Amino acid sequence: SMKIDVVTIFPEYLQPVRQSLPGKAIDAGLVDVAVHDLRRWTHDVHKSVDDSPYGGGPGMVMKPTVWGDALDEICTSETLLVVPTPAGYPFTQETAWQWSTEDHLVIACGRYEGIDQRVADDAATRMRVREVSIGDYVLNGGEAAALVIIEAVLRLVPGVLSLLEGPSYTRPPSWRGMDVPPVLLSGDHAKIAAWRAEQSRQRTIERRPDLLGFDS
Amino acid sequence: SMKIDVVTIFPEYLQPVRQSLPGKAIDAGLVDVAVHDLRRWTHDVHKSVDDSPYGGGPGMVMKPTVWGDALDEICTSETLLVVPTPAGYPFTQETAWQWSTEDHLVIACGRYEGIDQRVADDAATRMRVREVSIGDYVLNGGEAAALVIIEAVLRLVPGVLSLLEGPSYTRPPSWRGMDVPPVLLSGDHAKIAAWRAEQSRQRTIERRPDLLG
Numbered sequence A: 001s002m003k004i005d006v007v008t009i010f011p012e013y014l015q016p017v018r019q020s021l022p023g024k025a026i027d028a029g030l031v032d033v034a035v036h037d038l039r040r041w042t043h044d045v046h047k048s049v050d051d052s053p054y055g056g057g058p059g060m061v062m063k064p065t066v067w068g069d070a071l072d073e074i075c076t077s078e079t080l081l082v083v084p085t086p087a088g089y090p091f092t093q094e095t096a097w098q099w100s101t102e103d104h105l106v107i108a109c110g111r112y113e114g115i116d117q118r119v120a121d122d123a124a125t126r127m128r129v130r131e132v133s134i135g136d137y138v139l140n141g142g143e144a145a146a147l148v149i150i151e152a153v154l155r156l157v158p159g160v161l162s163l164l165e166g167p168s169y170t171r172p173p174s175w176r177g178m179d180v181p182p183v184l185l186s187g188d189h190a191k192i193a194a195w196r197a198e199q200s201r202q203r204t205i206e207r208r209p210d211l212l213g214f215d216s
Numbered sequence B: 001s002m003k004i005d006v007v008t009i010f011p012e013y014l015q016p017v018r019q020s021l022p023g024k025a026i027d028a029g030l031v032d033v034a035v036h037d038l039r040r041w042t043h044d045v046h047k048s049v050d051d052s053p054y055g056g057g058p059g060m061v062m063k064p065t066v067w068g069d070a071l072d073e074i075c076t077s078e079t080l081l082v083v084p085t086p087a088g089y090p091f092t093q094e095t096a097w098q099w100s101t102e103d104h105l106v107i108a109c110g111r112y113e114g115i116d117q118r119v120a121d122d123a124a125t126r127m128r129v130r131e132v133s134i135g136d137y138v139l140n141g142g143e144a145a146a147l148v149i150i151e152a153v154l155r156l157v158p159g160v161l162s163l164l165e166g167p168s169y170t171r172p173p174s175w176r177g178m179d180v181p182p183v184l185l186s187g188d189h190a191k192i193a194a195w196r197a198e199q200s201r202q203r204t205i206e207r208r209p210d211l212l213g
């Protein structure tokens, strides 16, 4: 069984929910998802987890010490440590497929400004570390990215179950004066493929020219 | 006072949590977030929200009669209808900024295979509709994309609070045999900025060569 540990200062946000893809996976015994409050590894009265950046700049940086004790306790040398970060390598469908075979994912959730770089540098001496971004929009912390990563990876785990998709339709064949493309009604597996391919092309070149090796 | 309506078949999954950034925004009265179970608008005892695709093929497509009724009830002509879909335009930071000043976002969450296309086509005749993807990895449904969209947008609402960022550091100066780069403690702030410029250049070359052209 796969085991996923998430570490965060927002454990309630990351608490698994039964009616969800991860929830189904958990209840099917295919995965154990444990969530940990990073503040467990603080020792000061105020439970401080970050501090001002050396060299200045806006915002705060998470303290290396607290993350240190946390990952010390939760990780082994076989652990794949995932660290969401705006500055990471891209998280892709290829990445998802790869992590779907993993035995232990530990996901370190930190604020946008980052965890002290020495945390990941130190972890890499004992385990595999992957700093990744799920997109170039800006989230305030790694929490939502952790939820995205979990859903992308879990749906690939055995047992759990290029080009843009063109439009899709279902019943009724006429709705509010709008008709389904007749080829999709004609039952011709060949003509239908020709049409869907053509639609996908038009859509991809319009919305994602990058996918076909073009600019913008 | 932004309003966000989310429509989903996983309303518990999307329920706002007090201890989160969206929870802070709501508690601060800076936004109202309403989550609606899509099954409220189903027609049959089985509360059917999807149906098999015309032209055949795998998966299910979400029913237009059900979504049509939900959106009729929830949207107005001033609504910006957000439809997360892997087939969408990329959701970017410029998009988040734009949406950060909308009075009413409605986010329609559907399964990967998507919603009958007529739903969006119809809605676009009365309101602004944006189909967007948050990434090329595959999610089973738009629910997590919704959470992402919401967090990227809300953190740009006043009051809630080309190159990669380089490493950041804080105390202690020496930790487990690793020292904060001396230059950060130099009090030479022009130099620090050039140093961080160079850190960004290299990390970007190494991790995201796509942002260099």
Ligand SMILES: OC1NC=Nc2ccccc21
Residues within 6 Å of the ligand: A084, A085, A086, A110, A111, A112, A132, A133, A134, A135, A136, A137, A138, A139, A140, A141, A142, A143, A145
């Ligand atoms: O992967 C990310 N994309 C955008 N913002 C982030 C903020 C914190 C962690 C991770 C991300």
Ligand SMILES: OC1NC=Nc2ccccc21
Residues within 6 Å of the ligand: B084, B085, B086, B110, B111, B112, B132, B133, B134, B135, B136, B137, B138, B139, B140, B141, B142, B143, B145
């Ligand atoms: O933006 C998306 N990326 C990947 N999968 C999705 C599934 C449903 C809606 C949206 C997305």
